[PDB]
Amino acid sequence: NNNTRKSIRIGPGQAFYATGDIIGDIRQAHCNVSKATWNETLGKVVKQLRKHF
Amino acid sequence: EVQLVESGPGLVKASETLSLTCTVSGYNIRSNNWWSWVRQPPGKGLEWIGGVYANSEITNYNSSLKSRVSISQDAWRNKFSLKLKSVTDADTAVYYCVRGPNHWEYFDSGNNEYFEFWGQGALVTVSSA
Amino acid sequence: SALTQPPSVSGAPGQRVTISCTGENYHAFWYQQFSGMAPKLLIRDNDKRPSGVSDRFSGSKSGASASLTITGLQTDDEADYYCQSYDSGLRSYIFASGTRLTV
Numbered sequence A: 001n002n003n004t005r006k007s008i009r010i011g012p013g014q015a016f017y018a019t020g021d022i023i024g025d026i027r028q029a030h031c032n033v034s035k036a037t038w039n040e041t042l043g044k045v046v047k048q049l050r051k052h053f
Numbered sequence B: 001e002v003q004l005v006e007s008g009p010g011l012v013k014a015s016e017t018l019s020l021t022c023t024v025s026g027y028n029i030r031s032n033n034w035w036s037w038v039r040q041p042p043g044k045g046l047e048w049i050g051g052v053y054a055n056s057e058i059t060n061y062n063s064s065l066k067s068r069v070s071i072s073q074d075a076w077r078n079k080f081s082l083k084l085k086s087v088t089d090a091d092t093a094v095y096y097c098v099r100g101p102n103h104w105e106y107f108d109s110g111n112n113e114y115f116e117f118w119g120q121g122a123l124v125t126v127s128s129a
Numbered sequence C: 001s002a003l004t005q006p007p008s009v010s011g012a013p014g015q016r017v018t019i020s021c022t023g024e025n026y027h028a029f030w031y032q033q034f035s036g037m038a039p040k041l042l043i044r045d046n047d048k049r050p051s052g053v054s055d056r057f058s059g060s061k062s063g064a065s066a067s068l069t070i071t072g073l074q075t076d077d078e079a080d081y082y083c084q085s086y087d088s089g090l091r092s093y094i095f096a097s098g099t100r101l102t103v
């Protein structure tokens, strides 16, 4: 998304930077990851961690 | 589920700006799509103007006629709000308002934005008499 | 630059006729228009036929032209037809004038 700043004023010399409008439609916020990488890397953790268990 | 109802002045006189607003119903005015206009003078084709991109301050126009227009988008009421400046009697037509293709991420279709929902169409004739 | 279309077509019912366009590197969209009725999109994304339109329409793009075919012409199809597409006139969709089907 792509929001907007609005500057409320709440006293002499104090501006409160509140949100204005959301420009567009509300899609979610996400962080992907690789998948062949995360499967390999999680497979190197188990090989090392078996040495203690 | 858009159903665009429009209503203009009804009969404008020459060298006086006219305005039309397309009341959107059944759908919000925030969907990443272009909200644009078009005209169909009797005879020549469906001459187009430009849009507003649901509620930003970003626009494109029709340089094929010129950059007279200054269309806005006032939401929270679902208004659509065309404004035509310095009209002459040659501008008479029937006016249609139309939205875009409802992209997913702000500009997915590079340059397509085909006009897919034509609401009802309204006509105004401009003359000194 | 600008596009151009044959002014008129004609054909008796129960026929296979195509309306063809001139030309680019983009897609093309086809609109019908009943006399006295608001236009409606009919073909987008060269084939990709939308929902609620008759299956009897089918588009296709050639090397530099696009045409849509219709099977079993019927009187309710006497509407006009428009070829719509963008160009590199820097801007400004440059869809050509239409051709009215006559039965």
Ligand SMILES: *[C@@H]1O[C@H](CO)[C@@H](O[C@@H]2O[C@H](CO)[C@@H](O[C@@H]3O[C@H](CO[C@H]4O[C@H](CO)[C@@H](O)[C@H](O)[C@@H]4O)[C@@H](O)[C@H](O[C@H]4O[C@H](CO)[C@@H](O)[C@H](O)[C@@H]4O[C@H]4O[C@H](CO)[C@@H](O)[C@H](O)[C@@H]4O[C@H]4O[C@H](CO)[C@@H](O)[C@H](O)[C@@H]4O)[C@@H]3O)[C@H](O)[C@H]2NC(C)=O)[C@H](O)[C@H]1NC(C)=O
Pocket (backbone or CB within 6 Å): A030, A031, A032, B101, B102, B103, B104, B105, B108, B109, B112, B113, C045
């Ligand atoms: C993290 O990973 C995730 C996934 O692992 C990443 O998220 C993925 O991002 C992809 C691209 O950003 C996205 O792909 C899109 O999916 C859309 C989902 O469609 C939904 O609705 C349909 C119903 O039609 C369902 O079937 C589907 O399952 C979904 O629920 C698609 O709609 C998109 O396809 C459109 O664009 C492609 C390419 O442009 C076209 O080939 C396709 O035909 C669609 O074209 C429509 O939209 C364009 C946009 O302008 C128009 O030009 C075009 O004319 C079409 O518009 C008409 O048709 C649609 C119906 O298709 C209609 O709604 C519209 O109103 C018009 O009538 C696109 O393919 C993945 O879905 C998404 N994955 C997930 C899980 O969300 C993410 O990016 C990763 N993170 C980062 C940081 O990248």
Ligand SMILES: *[C@@H]1O[C@H](CO)[C@@H](O[C@@H]2O[C@H](CO)[C@@H](O[C@@H]3O[C@H](CO)[C@@H](O)[C@H](O[C@H]4O[C@H](CO)[C@@H](O)[C@H](O)[C@@H]4O)[C@@H]3O)[C@H](O)[C@H]2NC(C)=O)[C@H](O)[C@H]1NC(C)=O
Pocket (backbone or CB within 6 Å): A020, A021, A022, B072, B074, B075, B076
């Ligand atoms: C959350 O709810 C609040 C209300 O509880 C809502 O705030 C409303 O926002 C709209 C748009 O920001 C305001 O509408 C204004 O109305 C006045 C009078 O009608 C107009 O003068 C304003 O228009 C001016 O600006 C336009 C753009 O330049 C011009 O076209 C116009 O001619 C004017 O110059 C504007 O339309 C509305 O007043 C408030 N509500 C109240 C009570 O003041 C808010 O929008 C809601 N949240 C979200 C995200 O929408």
Ligand SMILES: *[C@@H]1O[C@H](CO)[C@@H](O)[C@H](O)[C@H]1NC(C)=O
Pocket (backbone or CB within 6 Å): A032, A033, A034
């Ligand atoms: C992450 O984003 C970068 C940005 O360029 C891209 O090169 C890379 O392929 C992306 N990888 C994953 C796993 O999302």
Ligand SMILES: *[C@@H]1O[C@H](CO)[C@@H](O)[C@H](O)[C@H]1NC(C)=O
Pocket (backbone or CB within 6 Å): A039, A040, A043
């Ligand atoms: C990918 O993950 C699955 C999940 O259990 C695992 O069985 C498989 O061995 C993993 N792939 C590789 C190459 O290790």
